[PDB]
Amino acid sequence: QHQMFDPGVADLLDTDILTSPSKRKRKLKSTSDRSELEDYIVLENVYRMFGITFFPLVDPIDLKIKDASGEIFVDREMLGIRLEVFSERTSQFEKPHYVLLKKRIKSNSWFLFKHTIPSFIDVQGIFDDTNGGLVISHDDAYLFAKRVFLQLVEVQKRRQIFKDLEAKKIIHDLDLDLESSMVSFFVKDIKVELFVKQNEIVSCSILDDIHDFSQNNKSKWEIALLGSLDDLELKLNHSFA
Amino acid sequence: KDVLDVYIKNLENQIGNKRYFLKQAQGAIDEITKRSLDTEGKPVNSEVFTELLRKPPIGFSLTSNFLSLRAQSSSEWLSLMNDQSVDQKAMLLLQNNINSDLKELLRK
Amino acid sequence: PYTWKFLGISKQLSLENGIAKLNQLLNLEVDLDIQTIRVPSDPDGGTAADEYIRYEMRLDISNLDEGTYSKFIFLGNSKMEVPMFLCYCGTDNRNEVVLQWLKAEYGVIMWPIKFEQKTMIKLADASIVHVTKENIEQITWFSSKLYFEPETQDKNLRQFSIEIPRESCEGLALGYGNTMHPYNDAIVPYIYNETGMAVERLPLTSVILAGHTKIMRESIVTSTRSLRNRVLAVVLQSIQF
Amino acid sequence: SSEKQWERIQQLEKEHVEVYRELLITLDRLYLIRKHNHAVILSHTQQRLLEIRHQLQINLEKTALLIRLLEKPDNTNVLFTKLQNLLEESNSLDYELLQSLGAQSSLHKQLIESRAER
Amino acid sequence: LNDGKEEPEIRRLRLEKNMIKFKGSANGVMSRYSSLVPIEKVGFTLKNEINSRIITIKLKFNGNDIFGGLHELCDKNLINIDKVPGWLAGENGSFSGTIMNGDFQREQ
Amino acid sequence: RVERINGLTNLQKELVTKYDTLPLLNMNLRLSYLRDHTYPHLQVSVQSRDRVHNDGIEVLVVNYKFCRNTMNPFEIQFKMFYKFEDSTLLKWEILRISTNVRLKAKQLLATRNFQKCLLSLYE
């Protein structure tokens, strides 16, 4: 070994880290962690395979000190919810949705602080309805979360079937509102206006005028188009002509 | 990047080596000065100092900083220097004008 | 309505010695009062070096407006490195005439005065305080209004204000406890705690005590015809270096 | 790019030499206090001779790696290519400083003769 | 409040801290100060209880982007980031209102 | 100070460094929020996990146990294949079911959209 230190200096100065980097690498800092995160998140995938998915969250400003132990704590708890829907149309998942809840200072009860859910889903009203508005338990929070999730699935479920109908050329081009409640489409040359609740058509309108499209023909077509959405594809294909 | 990556890693490891060297060194200083239980100091013998005067990437660091610090500090000196010359010369020509003006006042 | 402007004096001129040549210069005779005052009588402010000597000089051919009412104030003290300053009010240009006489007569050199933000806060503290005939301090509360005007990129934040009614000021002062300079003692720390804002550092432009005075970058505006003594003492202590 | 790491070293080398110098300053008088248990009172001239020796050690070490890099100017190490410019500047800058340092004395002499005249 | 003797990296992450506190993302999802939706005017009114006494502070801001300007002041170190509340940072954007019990309430 | 954080990070330092608002990435925290705060009494475990690197396709067989009724919990096992890239599922298969729920759950499991099946079994 060369004189990293003089032999009259290495006599006292410890040389251990130069004999082995372990003594030095001990301070600087593994294989197991990278390989076990593997299976845990694979299970986390398997849990995102359920759709309704609580996820954690916090707010920065609500952190303070306990003044004696020099330790930090959070004033107000915060819950996060992630809302994934399986898109059978693509075998992938749609861009998720999130809703976030905070605790009141005095009441020790949740309140709706921030959320990603669009305004046509009245999340505040759902929250105020849950347990009379006194949302406390995580079970009440999951009731609220399930309600909003079913309300989102009731949108994706309509969008998926309508895009499927478009894909197979059962209908010509179409335009959709944001929540897929009012939808307009040309079938071959006839065009139709629909207004749908969750899973069901509630009103229909046929606009085009055709020689065989008498008022009685028009009326019975418009009436037959009502009902559950699952049968719409079948009955439209049957009424192709 | 790899050549600079490997070199930064080697120099960081050597920096850590030097940190441990300094820490254990100052620990030795503290313990052997504790052996110097008295506040007084032993006259460092010439013969002991003589035999210390007979026994003893690092250089690239040494070259790089001796040279770079030779770079801007020089330009700063001449620039601050030349900045002094230009305005003190301006004082001098104003100085000579007043002297030249006052020189004829003296004749007056 | 009563504005003011302050100038510094580089020598402790005895103004009474020279009154006559001013009088003939101004074509009128001016009054000259003499007061030896003890303004910072509080114990932490001091009990020595309080012996400021105050001069009231007036150019009143009449007193129908500020310009005619325009009255000068000289206040000085021999222990003060720059010994004396000057105050005057109104738009009357005879002020300029007397200033010219001063500088030409006593060989004295004079300059205008500015204020710092902390100087402004101290001056505002000095404005509210009053002393009874029993030599006892007392405080009169006014609805303070801090008014800032920062410089920011693209005029992102042009100006902003912090208005504090009488009740909030009094409550903050009482919460801090019995004190004498509430604006510095209590109000500004409360603002900083609630907003993280350092009022001292921020670019203050004015401090307005509603119906009482306006304190500004270059001048003092006062509801009363005159300035109480602590104002002048604070000014003098601000002149120095 | 590589410039980030290059500048990381441009600061870590200042750290490295600062620490190497204090390490020498600890080592030398640690050996001296090893010879005598309380040899802490090394003199001003003794300290200065020690400093001179350490400056000569700077000389030898920077010479050593200058030899390492320039004895075979192969330009394989990208750092060596930067050290070339870093060496070029250090000796290119010198002439202006020398000339201005010389000229200011004459300018100040002009000032002095003007003051004497005055 | 107490108080160049500084180095790049920690300053970089301090600026990132200010960025996220005023923008929500390290990359700064939309200059470094322009905000998503610039706000020209906001009026706040704090109501806090001290010693069973209610205290009112009403802040009024004006400009082209209030929170961008406040962000600039934070960068210049006139305001402490850790003590800026959310309503002052820009949440509840475009809504002037009263804050009681740590909960924002839109003005009627 | 400056720190590097990931899914394994201690929640305390994530919180102390928390000046953003993004989801907490602490991984067992997400797994717990899934496992015993929105799906309590759902004891699930992945039985096999090998990925075919040559095809680049993950292969899973994952076993569930629904233990609301601890006197007779019912169980199910999904095999499952997804692309491992572009986020797409290839197929999934129910390898195993406890007989105690076989018929009563078969119609549900006959339906696709696994989300439906799993969370409906839960409820």
Swiss-Prot record, chain A:
Q: Where is this protein chiefly located?
A: nucleus
Cellular component per GO? Answer: COMA complex; kinetochore
What GO biological process terms does the UniProt entry carry, in alphabetical order? attachment of spindle microtubules to kinetochore; cell division; centromere complex assembly; establishment of mitotic sister chromatid cohesion; negative regulation of meiotic DNA double-strand break formation involved in reciprocal meiotic recombination; protein localization to chromosome, centromeric region
Q: Which domain of life is it from?
A: Eukaryota
Q: What else is known?
A: Present with 952 molecules/cell in log phase SD medium.
User: What family name appears in the similarity comment?
Assistant: Belongs to the CENP-O/MCM21 family.
Q: Describe the protein's quaternary organization and the partners it interacts with.
A: Component of the heterotetrameric kinetochore subcomplex COMA, which consists of AME1, CTF19, MCM21 and OKP1. The COMA subcomplex is part of a larger constitutive centromere-associated network (CCAN) (also known as central kinetochore CTF19 complex in yeast), which is composed of at least AME1, CHL4, CNN1, CTF3, CTF19, IML3, MCM16, MCM21, MCM22, MHF1, MHF2, MIF2, NKP1, NKP2, OKP1 and WIP1. COMA binds the centromeric nucleosome-binding protein MIF2, and to the outer kinetochore MIND subcomplex.
| Protein name stated in the entry | Inner kinetochore subunit MCM21
Q: Which gene encodes it?
A: MCM21
| Parent sequence residues shown | 120 to 364 of 368
Swiss-Prot record, chain B:
**Localized where?**
Nucleus; Chromosome, Centromere, Kinetochore
Gene name? Answer: MCM22
Report the superkingdom from the record. Answer: Eukaryota
* Protein family: Belongs to the CENP-K/MCM22 family.
Q: What function does this protein fulfil? A: Component of the kinetochore, a multiprotein complex that assembles on centromeric DNA and attaches chromosomes to spindle microtubules, mediating chromosome segregation and sister chromatid segregation during meiosis and mitosis. Component of the inner kinetochore constitutive centromere-associated network (CCAN), which serves as a structural platform for outer kinetochore assembly.
Q: Anything else of interest in the record?
A: Present with 1026 molecules/cell in log phase SD medium.
Q: What binding partners and quaternary form does the record give?
A: Component of the heterotrimeric kinetochore subcomplex CTF3, which consists of CTF3, MCM16 and MCM22. The CTF3 subcomplex is part of a larger constitutive centromere-associated network (CCAN) (also known as central kinetochore CTF19 complex in yeast), which is composed of at least AME1, CHL4, CNN1, CTF3, CTF19, IML3, MCM16, MCM21, MCM22, MHF1, MHF2, MIF2, NKP1, NKP2, OKP1 and WIP1. Interacts with CTF19.
S-S bridge residues: none
Give the protein name, as stated in the record. Inner kinetochore subunit MCM22
Curated annotation (Swiss-Prot), chain D:
* Cellular component GO terms, alphabetical: kinetochore; nucleus
Q: Where do transmembrane segments lie in this chain?
A: none
Keywords from the named record? Cell cycle, Cell division, Centromere, Chromosome, Coiled coil, Kinetochore, Meiosis, Mitosis, Nucleus
Task: State where it is primarily located.
Answer: nucleus
Report the record's Gene Ontology biological process terms: attachment of spindle microtubules to kinetochore; cell division; chromosome segregation; establishment of mitotic sister chromatid cohesion; meiotic cell cycle
Q: Where in the cell is it found?
A: Nucleus; Chromosome, Centromere, Kinetochore
Extra information: Present with 279 molecules/cell in log phase SD medium.
Query: Which family is it part of?
Result: Belongs to the CENP-H/MCM16 family.
Give the multimer and partner information.
Component of the heterotrimeric kinetochore subcomplex CTF3, which consists of CTF3, MCM16 and MCM22. The CTF3 subcomplex is part of a larger constitutive centromere-associated network (CCAN) (also known as central kinetochore CTF19 complex in yeast), which is composed of at least AME1, CHL4, CNN1, CTF3, CTF19, IML3, MCM16, MCM21, MCM22, MHF1, MHF2, MIF2, NKP1, NKP2, OKP1 and WIP1. Interacts with CTF19.
Q: State its role.
A: Component of the kinetochore, a multiprotein complex that assembles on centromeric DNA and attaches chromosomes to spindle microtubules, mediating chromosome segregation and sister chromatid segregation during meiosis and mitosis. Component of the inner kinetochore constitutive centromere-associated network (CCAN), which serves as a structural platform for outer kinetochore assembly.
Quote the protein name from its UniProt record: Inner kinetochore subunit MCM16
UniProtKB/Swiss-Prot annotation, chain E:
Q: Quote the subcellular location field of this record.
A: Nucleus; Chromosome, Centromere, Kinetochore
Q: How does it assemble?
A: Forms a heterodimer with IML3. CHL4-IML3 is part of a larger constitutive centromere-associated network (CCAN) (also known as central kinetochore CTF19 complex in yeast), which is composed of at least AME1, CHL4, CNN1, CTF3, CTF19, IML3, MCM16, MCM21, MCM22, MHF1, MHF2, MIF2, NKP1, NKP2, OKP1 and WIP1. Interacts with CTF3 and CTF19.
UniProt lists the family membership as follows:
Belongs to the CENP-N/CHL4 family.
Q: What else is known?
A: Present with 606 molecules/cell in log phase SD medium.
Protein role: Component of the kinetochore, a multiprotein complex that assembles on centromeric DNA and attaches chromosomes to spindle microtubules, mediating chromosome segregation and sister chromatid segregation during meiosis and mitosis. Component of the inner kinetochore constitutive centromere-associated network (CCAN), which serves as a structural platform for outer kinetochore assembly.
> Per its record, how is this protein called by name?
Inner kinetochore subunit CHL4
The taxonomy runs: Eukaryota, Fungi, Dikarya, Ascomycota, Saccharomycotina
Q: Which gene encodes it?
A: CHL4
Q: List the range of the whole protein covered here.
A: 307 to 451 of 458
